[PDB]
Amino acid sequence: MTEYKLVVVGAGGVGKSALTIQLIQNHFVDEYDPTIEDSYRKQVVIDGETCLLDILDTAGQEEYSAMRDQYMRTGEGFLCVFAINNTKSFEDIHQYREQIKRVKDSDDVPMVLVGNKCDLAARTVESRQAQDLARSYGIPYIETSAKTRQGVEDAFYTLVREIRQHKLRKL
């Protein structure tokens, strides 16, 4: 079947493992070891297509850049996640995008911007600032909650769709 190599990138504590796990085993996990970086697979049907998703849940002292190299140049799409309540994780998004553009040699690599923890009623990053940021980047922005599961399938599947279009564009 088709295999999409995805990389979930972002500051620590944003919820990268919680989103990944949520998608894979459909259950929320608080306290997953901040240090552990590993891949996860699941077979899914997205728009009629059966495919295998290969996800790298990035963890690591890797200064706001390219965690698991031999997966970064290979990733076909990146999920840039920040937390709706941590403005710093949100400002750090530019740096990940630049490293991703840097290793991949292009400003046309599939990516989706994810504002996670939207279940927290608080926020230090308003929905509108994120959408303008995404807009200027030309990428989608989706709000998710690993805690309640809202938006996690839309986030990853939007990323697959982006990869699909991008492949279809060389013809």
146 binds ligand GDP (CB under 6 A): yes
**Residue 30 in marked binding region:** yes
34 binds ligand GDP (CB under 6 A): yes
For 5-92, where are the alpha helices, taking DSSP H only? 16-25, 69-72, 87-91
Q: What crossing angle do the helices spanning 16-25 and 152-168 adopt, rounded to 10°? A: 90
**Residue 15 in marked binding region:** yes
**Residue 108 in marked binding region:** no
For 15-92, where are the alpha helices, taking DSSP H only? 16-25, 69-72, 87-91
Q: Which of residues 75-134 bind a second copy (CB under 8 A)?
A: 87, 91, 94, 98, 107, 129-130, 132-133
- Least separation, in Å, of the C-beta of 133 and a second copy? 4
CA distance 24 to 19: 9
- Residues of this chain that interact with a second copy (CB under 8 A) are 87, 91, 94, 98, 107, 129-130, 132-133, 135-136, 138
